């Protein structure tokens, strides 16, 4: 199937109390493989997956230099964006950057992307074509003008549809023992009376590796998307994910409710029903 390589950066200004906290994380699909934390002991890019550890000292030296350089741009940009948005020097602000690429099962380039945020809102994003930018407001347009002039998109594209794709293909080959795995969801249903007259039917999906999943509740075919408590997909902590969906049903009417489980690692969408006596 399809794979991705993504880098995530967060820089948080610490007004007066030193330089900003920078955290960088690299992922292949949903598996973290590198990290850098400005507050950590090493002051270097560190391995986080066994299949990346086999990389040489020139690899870790380069990654360290290049991640620190990103950290320094972010430091400048925090002051620049405080200027653009007309904010005081007293408050703490955040810059978030996400960039990366997708490749198909043949390893062919599918998409490249870059999105930036300031204080948890869109700031600027590279468009799907990898040639143009979309600024979220008029201050962000100033960045766009500067990048359009500097031909930043061509420089970024060279990485997103070239450098990124080359190394993603390498990482997928180096981690072929673990990254090509897909674990399908282990499904089940639970029942919890909330009184003498009603009960919670809870539909579970555990140990699934493509974090993407769909859990829906239907009362006699008709969707119950308004009376469903859906929890955010969460990590089990061993690379697999978990999710549950719940509905409060009148006692004796449990058989009227169905839980539909759509996942990619599943041949056909699983249907679950409370097996009454």
């Amino acid at each position: 199937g399809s794979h991705s390589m993504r880098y995530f950066f967060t820089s948080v200004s610490r007004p007066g109390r030193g330089e900003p906290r920078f955290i960088a994380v690299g992922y292949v699909d949903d598996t973290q493989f590198v990290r850098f934390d400005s507050d950590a002991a090493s002051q270097r890019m560190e391995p986080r997956a066994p299949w990346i550890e086999q990389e040489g000292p020139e690899y870790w030296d380069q990654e360290t230099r290049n991640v620190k350089a990103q950290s320094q741009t972010d430091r400048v940009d925090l002051g620049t964006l405080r200027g653009y948005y007309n904010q005081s020097e007293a408050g703490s602000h955040t810059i978030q950057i996400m960039y990366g690429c997708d490749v198909g099962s043949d390893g062919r380039f599918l998409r490249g992307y870059r999105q930036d945020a300031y204080d948890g809102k869109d700031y600027i994003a590279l468009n799907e074509d990898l040639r143009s930018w979309t600024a979220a407001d008029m201050a962000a347009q100033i960045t766009k003008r500067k990048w359009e002039a500097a031909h930043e998109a061509e420089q970024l594209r060279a990485y997103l549809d070239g450098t990124c794709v080359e190394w993603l293909r390498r990482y997928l080959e180096n981690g072929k023992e673990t990254l090509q795995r897909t674990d399908p969801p282990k499904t089940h249903m639970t029942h919890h009376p909330i009184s003498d007259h009603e009960a919670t039917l809870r539909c579970w999906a555990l140990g699934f590796y493509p974090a993407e999943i769909t859990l829906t509740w239907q009362r006699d075919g008709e969707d119950q998307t308004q009376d469903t408590e859906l929890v955010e997909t969460r990590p089990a902590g061993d690379g697999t994910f978990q999710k549950w969906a719940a509905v409060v049903v009148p006692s004796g009417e449990e058989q009227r409710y169905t839980c539909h489980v759509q996942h990619e690692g599943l041949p056909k969408p699983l249907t679950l029903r409370w097996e009454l006596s």
Binding site: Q62, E63, A69, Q70, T73, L81, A150, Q155, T163
Partner: peptide, 9 residues
């Protein structure tokens, strides 16, 4: 691998 270059905002 992370980007080697980065243009400022």
């Amino acid at each position: 691998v992370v980007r080697p270059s980065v243009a400022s905002k």
